[PDB]
Amino acid sequence: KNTISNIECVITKPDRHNLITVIVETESGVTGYGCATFQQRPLAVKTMVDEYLKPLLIGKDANNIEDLWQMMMVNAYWRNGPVINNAISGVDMALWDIKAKIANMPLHQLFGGKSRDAIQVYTHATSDTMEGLYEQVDKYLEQGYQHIRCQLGFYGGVPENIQTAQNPTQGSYYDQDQYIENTVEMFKNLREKYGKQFHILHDVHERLFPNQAIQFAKQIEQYNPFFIEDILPPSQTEWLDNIRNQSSVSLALGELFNNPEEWKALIINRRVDFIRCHVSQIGGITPALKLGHFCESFGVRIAWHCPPDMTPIGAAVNTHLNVHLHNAAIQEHVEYKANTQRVFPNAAEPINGYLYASEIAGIGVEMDREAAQDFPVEYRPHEWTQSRLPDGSIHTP
Amino acid sequence: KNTISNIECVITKPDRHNLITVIVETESGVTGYGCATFQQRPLAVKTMVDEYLKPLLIGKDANNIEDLWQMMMVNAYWRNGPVINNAISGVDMALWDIKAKIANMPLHQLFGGKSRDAIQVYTHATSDTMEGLYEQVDKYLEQGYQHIRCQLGFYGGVPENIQTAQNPTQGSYYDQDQYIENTVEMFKNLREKYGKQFHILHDVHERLFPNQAIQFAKQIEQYNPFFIEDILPPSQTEWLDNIRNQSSVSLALGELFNNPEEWKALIINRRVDFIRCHVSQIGGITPALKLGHFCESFGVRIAWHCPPDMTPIGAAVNTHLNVHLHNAAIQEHVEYKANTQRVFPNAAEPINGYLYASEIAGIGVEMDREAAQDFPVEYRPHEWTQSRLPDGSIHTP
Amino acid sequence: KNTISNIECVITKPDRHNLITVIVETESGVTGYGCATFQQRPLAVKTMVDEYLKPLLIGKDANNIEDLWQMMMVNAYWRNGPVINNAISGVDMALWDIKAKIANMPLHQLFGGKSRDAIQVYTHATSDTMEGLYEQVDKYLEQGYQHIRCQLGFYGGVPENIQTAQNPTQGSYYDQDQYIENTVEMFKNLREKYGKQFHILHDVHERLFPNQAIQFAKQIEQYNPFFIEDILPPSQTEWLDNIRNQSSVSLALGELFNNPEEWKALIINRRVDFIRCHVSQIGGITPALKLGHFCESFGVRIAWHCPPDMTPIGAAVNTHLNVHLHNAAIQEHVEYKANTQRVFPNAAEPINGYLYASEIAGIGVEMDREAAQDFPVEYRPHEWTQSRLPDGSIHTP
Amino acid sequence: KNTISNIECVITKPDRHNLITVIVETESGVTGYGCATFQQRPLAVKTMVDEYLKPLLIGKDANNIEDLWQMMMVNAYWRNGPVINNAISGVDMALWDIKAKIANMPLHQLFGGKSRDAIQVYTHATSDTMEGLYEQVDKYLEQGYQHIRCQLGFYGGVPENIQTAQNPTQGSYYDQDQYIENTVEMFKNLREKYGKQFHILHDVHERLFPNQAIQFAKQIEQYNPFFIEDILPPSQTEWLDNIRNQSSVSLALGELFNNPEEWKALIINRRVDFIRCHVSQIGGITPALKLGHFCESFGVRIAWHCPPDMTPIGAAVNTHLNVHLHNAAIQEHVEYKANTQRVFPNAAEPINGYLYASEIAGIGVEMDREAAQDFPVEYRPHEWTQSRLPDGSIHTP
Amino acid sequence: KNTISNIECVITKPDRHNLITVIVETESGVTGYGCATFQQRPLAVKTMVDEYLKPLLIGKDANNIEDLWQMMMVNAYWRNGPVINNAISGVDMALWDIKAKIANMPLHQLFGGKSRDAIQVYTHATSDTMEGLYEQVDKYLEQGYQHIRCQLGFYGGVPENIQTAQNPTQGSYYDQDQYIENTVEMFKNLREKYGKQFHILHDVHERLFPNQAIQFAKQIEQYNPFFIEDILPPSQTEWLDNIRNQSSVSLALGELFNNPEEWKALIINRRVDFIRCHVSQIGGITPALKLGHFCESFGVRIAWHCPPDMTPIGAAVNTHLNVHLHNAAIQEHVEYKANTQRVFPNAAEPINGYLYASEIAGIGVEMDREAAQDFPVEYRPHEWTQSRLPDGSIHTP
Ligand SMILES: [Cl-]
Ligand SMILES: [Cl-]
Ligand SMILES: [Cl-]
Ligand SMILES: [Cl-]
Ligand SMILES: [Cl-]
Ligand SMILES: [Cl-]
Ligand SMILES: [Cl-]
Ligand SMILES: [Mg+2]
Ligand SMILES: [Mg+2]
Ligand SMILES: [Mg+2]
Ligand SMILES: [Mg+2]
Ligand SMILES: [Mg+2]
Ligand SMILES: [Mg+2]
């Protein structure tokens, strides 16, 4: 047995985002690290770990990750959701980290090994002008990326060019029709300039109503996007049947998921082509493996959410999952800055459009705890989540 | 308790339509006003209120709108339908008016308050020529409207350019193919001239057979109408699945509904994008709130029917519902003439494409009883409802 | 407008449970109180309110509850789940409390009034012997209760009479077959002694596997329980189809729900007869009203979860919902003790099997903030949630 | 890398069945052992390993079990089926053995560790009389078993009490009605004598036509069998819907499966409560983990086939899977005789109704190569598979 | 009775492929020949026949083909799959040959005679250039073929112009996008040059993911291919519904099938227009007839797989089945080489686009036993089955 001797939760903001790490110490002296990053509510996740998971977990056998996951998930009776799941994810990843270290193996080797040499990577280009897009796309192409998520225009902030009511309620405003029009124009221009040079992805980020999504699918399907992401919010994915029945568009969805009821009908009915779950939002590696296998039976492929608001520990974990799970398709990546790299040393970066899994024992990335102390948590409003349509209505952000 | 002391029903015809208002007096001294407008059969609604609802309601507690509504709906054993529901609606709306006045709140604040600053508005442009259309559209755009329901041609009357049988039966004649041809051409012409300057709506008004409706949807989907309204009659909406499976066209339906069985399967199967119910036809505010909530769970949005054959009291009520219900989308424009404005003082008018909810206590619009007496009920035959196809057969009007 | 001036969150444990109250102060000087009680993780809910909802909400208009609810729900981007929802519920209830106070009306009158005189109530009898059950049942019957949830045996703790593995993992042990056998025997004995004197309810509390649930339904259906509650866990309710296809048993489910995807298919497919949601777990009054209306269209009735781990504020709120919503069926009740009554004065208690809604302005129950300070939060392990079957497996608790 | 240096396949018959072991040697010096037992066609599996899998695998990296499995499955283009899957299983299991040995962990710890302390076990009682049954049951109960699979009568052989045609075709005869009659009587008798003392299982072994299966389910459901196994053959499992819609009987199925199309719709439609796959028939540990996860999402539990025609290596593997997979339920008992114990040293035996996973590195059971050579393959005709009904027609055996 | 006196299995490789023939001798002195060709695993098939089917079959009555098939199929208990089915097929075909020889009739006359004069034939044109394709196409049209399966490019081998990971794992590489692009261009060019001169077929050979298949279907439907073959792998055919709901493309699938669960739902749901099964893979003539009839009821037509890896005996059998079964559509043919013709004399060749059934007694084609000895089995690694995507992942080959 390997008895858990401590549980710690650290919030660090080396750069733009409040990142959250969980650290598990064991009587073997082997230490694990995991990602619990829910950037919008980090103090809630920390409270959850410090006040509840810690006294629950100290004294228990770290070897039995599966029991610990099943036990943790139901421990508050009420369950699922972002605060509990991220806290559990932090522990779950750290426990797998310890197991891999004790096995003296890279994490993906514990799983049963590689099913691919490395995972393909897509990056992000966003500009308010086509010329600006071209500038970023050109750089990415020169670096060997073959997949780029492109966006024309920025959506939010003050309603400068939007016909609102007289005294619009405070919020981040956009117009769905302007957004649709700019996006179609973007695809048309990118295909005219670049042809089939690279794969174009685009993130709808739940901006649209169902009728707008169906129209939009028919408008861009001719451009064969690698995928169109979050074309609807999680609560309206039954409307995907309307799209799947009449459009060939490739669809990805699910970074928002933190309850299994959100994805089961989605996958069984083949409503998307790629699942986009944020691994820490679904409770860590343990459920990620199961969900990977579930998708596989239905022919659904995997593109785990990999935003900047996630530790490099979490990213390395996703790369281990991505080189192992046969139905993994692509990894999202954004560049790390120097502070982040200092707090989380040895974070892999894409090489010629590929991310390579770590080959040392464990996850392969840890947190430098002294460095992390230099960057304490900092309150952020996240004003973009107060997203409003011209009439002042809230829309899923 | 707030005991009901009197119930009255007034039919008034300030301008082109017979309007119906129910007036509820209480022992608190607070009076409520409601819309019961079924313009085609007004004496029947008045008989229903005066002879049956009045002796039922006098003496009962106006506070308990929900009990009174559930009780009223089943009071005749047989139920649903346009005459009973309209009479009940008049009472139901007046009871809400009373409750809001006693609470000293605008009606929408009772409901739980605003979910938007104001509701967007669409107006109506109809002409026998394109230039006549352009004339009306230019005027509306200049007034700030962003949504216009357009129709080229008038359909009905003597069969002048229509090959009928030798001695055609008396009726109001049209040719469905001429109607389709003109409407497709109209859409084409408007997009050429105006591009994406405004949202174009069109009301099919149940003119078509299902195969025609399906053909029409494929013919106009490319023009992205904001919605195509009543593309089928209420009894044939299962045919919408054929449309939904192969077309992206945005659909609205339901102004004719007066029985819940007409809408449940519609909404459950996502057969339309907007519900168009006439609030008084479904029994008033009480069922309108439930239906709005019902639609919201399925992702269906709301565009309550707001024709000229409705009191300004009913319009105000609809704007109260529209600024409250989160899934409300748009409100139909009704320009009020001098006589109607005198009978129903303080009726809101759109300002720069928006209708604003009233902010005084209650509904915010009452009927001037003296002014209404000046304009008594007048029989109208509504010949357009005897709608006939070229072979002389009735079609749903 | 009524600007929010403060937001406070208090945890108090006057008796057995950590209760959580949210208090909203406004520039009008009118103060609201709401329930945010997630007893197993109270510090997490408090963190959520103090650190996040408070700076978000101060300065905003308390009148617009609907916008504030829609805005709050999506404010962390990721959403749903027990920690966020309870925090939002606390604010939502307090906002309705303020609106009712300003309207000078009892909460249920804001909603549209009563649809019943009072709500029927069921209470709880639990013993390890039939004789002990009879003793409690006899008292309840004498007090006028007509509905009693009965349980024979206590399930959990050390595996004294259970054949486990040699060195069973620490946990709370029970045997599903012993539990089934005791429960069937209980119903058989109660019907033999009491006949149809009262309505018997029973809470399966997700103890069973699907095959056991189906067997159990067929075993007790002859006893016509008023309902059998939580016969399956939330993740396995599709298995209810097997039961609904072959058994007449009345079913209730849903106290665990905190994501709408958990209940939509459940209700649309008529898989249960009563919905059991914990109002604070689903985000407060605002979504409770909508869910009430949703259920109503499908003929599903309401029995909101009313456990001891909920403030009397929350209970009074449920009674307001129960006398208003036409499809409300029954209210669960457990007696308050003197400390709890001191901290939450004027809490209604059942009278002859009925709970009467409060008739003063507002919710009708507040928290005495000095009294609450006498009873600070106290860590509880809740060892019963580590529920294990004889082989040491975790089972949903 | 850990390069494969040799692949061997040994058929050994220590006792009643031809057993098949695959042995994988690597350059690390670490040797793996796996089960490839298809007892009816052992020379075919050995040809498959020796002639095709050996030259394919030598030189490749044993670490990457997942790639090797995906590659092996499609290597012959045509795929699935009992000969190929068993050969692949032998390799797959040996590769997992190797990985666990290198990690210096018991196999189940690699997977993520335990979710139960040990797995419950059922044994088998079969006799031509009830008293003979009682004899075996009494012995098993006294040994600590709580689950016994019971069968009254032996079915097959010469048609002694069976009205066949004049000159019946050579085969193993039985009468389905005699079988049903004896089994119903057996259940009745066991419940009268033993009541609820133990769980009774029964294996129908695809003996019945669908109308017989449905009749039988209704006849024995009252006796609450722990499961009724293989009530239909694999090709007729859609007939299970008729059973599921009207009966509570608990069902197990799937020992015959060797193609995923055989189980997907089964599990998706909840047609059984327990999956019974033979791990080597589905291709080894790698697909067994995925299938367990797949079943878990649908609430289906696992009872892998553990017959005597399987190596103790395969049994140990199944116990490793059974203590890991949370939805594992029970393991079939196989008493090992002296010769088999010598060939496969250290095979676990049930202790008080439980099988405990091995705790040394690797699978924990190997084959003694010298001992196995003592017991070479011996042809068996397995006459029972020529199973005939009274009219002389083949029925699935 | 016609007692089986011997069973033999000969592997012969006169040209590029290991071919497998089963020979059945009877006491009548009449000898039958059948195809058991599974070219990738021939030694496993031969073991199956020699070690198991032979001692099973000798002594039994060859007259009763139906019983012999039902008996053979379940004789190993576990069943279906390519090794067992091919062995059984060789026997089944030889028995049908024997029966037809005894009746002194061509095989298809046994079945009930011709339903057509002859079967239309398609050939294969494949090249890395369009002009290379044109030469082959031109050759075929001159010979009277009216159907040609066309392929531009060769896919596999070393990843020369493919961006792989740094050290790509050994395998046969292709890029799906490159393949789709070339194939779409091929269709475009062929229709430009040839118009509707001939029917163009194309074999996707399970190279694509579902989202790619759906895109491809929409890209080529305008070119009206006679059929697009194997657009998905057998385990993913439920994705065909997405294609069938939005595309008019003609589809064929099934050469991989060796388990009826692979085809039933496929055909019941009309997911393909042509079934493509390999007759020996499904177990011979006996199940080919039933499957032909099953398809016919559903309106599905037959294009049995007729690759070079099949004996001319098996090809003759397919022509007998094709002139008999009313729903047979077309026969694939590859030109025979001289050594193959020597070993299997008198094999029919297409004449002006038609294949004519043999008119002598029996199948019409036998194996020259002495000639076959000149060409013993030779190992081949079939490296193309290790098909990898650019990232190193195995894809179904
Ligand atoms: Cl921010
Ligand atoms: Cl808007
Ligand atoms: Cl008129
Ligand atoms: Cl406790
Ligand atoms: Cl157990
Ligand atoms: Cl035998
Ligand atoms: Cl096989
Ligand atoms: Mg995204
Ligand atoms: Mg209309
Ligand atoms: Mg409960
Ligand atoms: Mg069995
Ligand atoms: Mg092919
Ligand atoms: Mg379609």
Q: What is the 3-state secondary structure (H, E, C) of B59-100?
A: CCECCCHHHHHHHHHHCCCCCCCHHHHHHHHHHHHHHHHHHH
The answer for residues whose C-beta is within 8 angstroms of residue E195's C-beta and 6 or more apart is none
Place of tokens 């405003």: A173
Decide if B225 contacts B189 (C-beta within 8 A): no
Q: Are residue E79 and residue E180 in the same domain, yes or no? A: no
Q: Are residue D187 and residue D333 in the same domain, yes or no? A: yes
D112:A96 CB<8 A: yes
Tell me the H-state helices in chain C. Answer: 42-48, 54-57, 65-73, 82-103, 107-111, 130-142, 176-194, 210-220, 240-244, 264-268, 285-297, 312-324, 338-343, 369-373
What is the identity of the amino acid at C85? N
Contacts of A321 in chain E (CB under 8 A): none
Rg (chain C; Cα; Å): 21
Q: How far is the CA of B161 from the centre of ligand 3 (A)?
A: 23
Q: How far is the CA of C382 from the centre of ligand 4 (A)?
A: 4
A44:C41 CB<8 A: no
Q: Is C185 on the interface with D (CB under 8 A)?
A: no
Is there an interface between C and B (3+ Cβ pairs < 8 A)? Answer: yes
B205 in a labelled binding site: yes
Tell me the H-state helices in D269-384. Answer: 285-297, 312-324, 338-343, 369-373
D297:A294 CB<8 A: yes
Q: A327: which DSSP letter?
A: T
Q: How far is the CA of A393 from the centre of ligand 2 (A)?
A: 7
Q: Which residues surround ligand 12, an ion (CB under 5 A)?
A: E 203
- Measure in Å the smallest separation between the Cα of E218 and chain D Cα atoms: 27
Q: Are residue A144 and residue A232 in the same domain, yes or no? A: yes
For residue D248, give the nearest of C167, C215, C394 by CB distance: C215
Place of tokens 């992205």: B224
Q: How far is the CA of C299 from the centre of ligand 7 (A)?
A: 54
Q: How many CB atoms lie within 10 A of CB E338?
A: 9
For β-strands A227-229 and A199-203, DSSP reports them as parallel
Contacts of A107 in chain D (CB under 8 A): none
Mapping DSSP to helix (H, G, I), strand (E, B) and coil, where does residue E149 land? strand
Question: Which helix H or strand E contains E132, and what residues bound it?
Answer: helix E130-142
- Measure in Å the smallest separation between the Cα of B54 and chain A Cα atoms: 40
Q: D3: which DSSP letter?
A: B
DSSP E35-104: E---TTSHHHHHHIIIIIIHHHHTTSBTT-HHHHHHHHHHTTSS--SHHHHHHHHHHHHHHHHHHHHHHT
A142 in a labelled binding site: no
What is the identity of the amino acid at B387? S
The sign of the torsion formed by the CA atoms of D195, C160, C187, D146 equals negative
In terms of Cα–Cα distance, which of C279, C286, C261, C281 is closest to C68? C286
Q: From the centroid of its chain, how far is CA B132?
A: 26
Please state, in angstroms and rounded to a whole number, the distance separating the CA atoms of residues D104 and A361. Answer: 14
Mutate to test the interface with C, among D116, D194, D226, D241 (most CBs of C within 10 A): D116
* Partners of A149 in the β-ladder: A124, A201
In terms of Cα–Cα distance, which of D156, D154, D152 is closest to D131? D152
N- to C-terminal Cα separation, chain C: 46
Mapping DSSP to helix (H, G, I), strand (E, B) and coil, where does residue E393 land? coil
Q: From the centroid of its chain, how far is CA D235?
A: 18
CA contacts within 13 A on the Cβ side of B172:
15
Tell me which residues of D are annotated as active site. Answer: 155, 205
Question: Which helix H or strand E contains D387, and what residues bound it?
Answer: strand D387-388
Q: Are residue B318 and residue B347 in the same domain, yes or no? A: yes
Is there an interface between B and D (3+ Cβ pairs < 8 A)? Answer: no
Nearest-Cα residue of chain E relative to residue D235: E261
Q: Are residue E116 and residue E97 in the same domain, yes or no? A: no
Q: How far is the CA of D379 from the centre of ligand 6 (A)?
A: 8
Q: Are residue B336 and residue B368 in the same domain, yes or no? A: no
Out of A17, A202, A205, A333, the active site residue is A205
Q: E280: which DSSP letter?
A: G
Residue C2 maps to which CATH number? 3.30.390.10
Q: How far is the CA of A16 from the centre of ligand 1 (A)?
A: 9
Is there an interface between C and E (3+ Cβ pairs < 8 A)? Answer: no
Q: Is A185 on the interface with B (CB under 8 A)?
A: no
Nearest-Cα residue of chain C relative to residue B268: C268
Q: B358: which DSSP letter?
A: P
Tell me the H-state helices in chain B. Answer: 42-48, 54-57, 65-74, 82-102, 107-111, 130-142, 176-194, 210-220, 240-244, 264-268, 285-297, 312-324, 338-343, 369-373
Decide if C155 contacts C207 (C-beta within 8 A): yes
For residue D81, give the nearest of E80, E382, E387 by CB distance: E80
A196:E217 CB<8 A: no
D305 in a labelled binding site: yes
- Measure in Å the smallest separation between the Cα of D298 and chain C Cα atoms: 7
What is the identity of the amino acid at B232? L
Please state, in angstroms and as integers, the Cα–Cα distance from residue E396 to each residue in A326, E208, E230, following that order. Answer: 12, 9, 11
Q: Are residue A313 and residue A179 in the same domain, yes or no? A: yes
* Order of strands across the sheet that contains D19-26: D4-12, D19-26, D31-35
- Measure in Å the smallest separation between the Cα of C96 and chain B Cα atoms: 8
- CB-defined contacts A:B, below 8 A: 70
B113:C289 CB<8 A: no
Q: Is B103 on the interface with C (CB under 8 A)?
A: yes
The sign of the torsion formed by the CA atoms of B139, B141, B144, B149 equals positive
Q: Are residue A6 and residue A43 in the same domain, yes or no? A: yes
CA contacts within 13 A on the Cβ side of E217:
30
Please state, in angstroms and rounded to a whole number, the distance separating the CA atoms of residues A383 and A172. Answer: 7
Tell me the H-state helices in B3-64. Answer: 42-48, 54-57
Q: Is C114 on the interface with B (CB under 8 A)?
A: yes
Please state, in angstroms and rounded to a whole number, the distance separating the CA atoms of residues D168 and E111. Answer: 28
E74:D397 CB<8 A: yes
Buried b (16+ CB within 10 A) or exposed e, D285-300: bbbbbbbbbbbbbbbb
The parent domain of residue A235 ranges over 107-359
Tell me which residues of B are annotated as active site. Answer: 155, 205
Q: Are residue E36 and residue E122 in the same domain, yes or no? A: no
Q: Are residue D123 and residue D245 in the same domain, yes or no? A: yes
Experimental technique behind these coordinates = X-ray
Q: Are residue A366 and residue A355 in the same domain, yes or no? A: no
Domain count, chain B: 2
List the structure tokens of A67. Answer: 């029991």
Q: How far is the CA of E82 from the centre of ligand 7 (A)?
A: 5
Residue B224 maps to which CATH number? 3.20.20.120
Q: What is the resolution of this structure in A?
A: 1.9
DSSP E165-182: -SSPPSSEE--HHHHHHH
Exposed, middle or buried by CB within 10 Å (0-12, 13-18, 19+), for B194? middle
Q: Are residue D353 and residue D368 in the same domain, yes or no? A: no
For residue D64, give the nearest of A67, A114, A297 by CB distance: A114
Looking at the CA of D203, which ligand is closest?
11
Decide if B132 contacts B154 (C-beta within 8 A): no
Mapping DSSP to helix (H, G, I), strand (E, B) and coil, where does residue B158 land? coil
Q: How many CB atoms lie within 10 A of CB B88?
A: 30
B111:C66 CB<8 A: yes
Q: Which residues surround ligand 10, an ion (CB under 5 A)?
A: C 203, 255
A27 in a labelled binding site: no
Q: What are phi and psi of E68, to 5 degrees?
A: -60, -40
D293 in a labelled binding site: no
Please state, in angstroms and rounded to a whole number, the distance separating the CA atoms of residues C350 and C329. Answer: 15
Q: From the centroid of its chain, how far is CA C332?
A: 8
Chains that touch C (3 or more CB pairs under 8 A): A, B, D
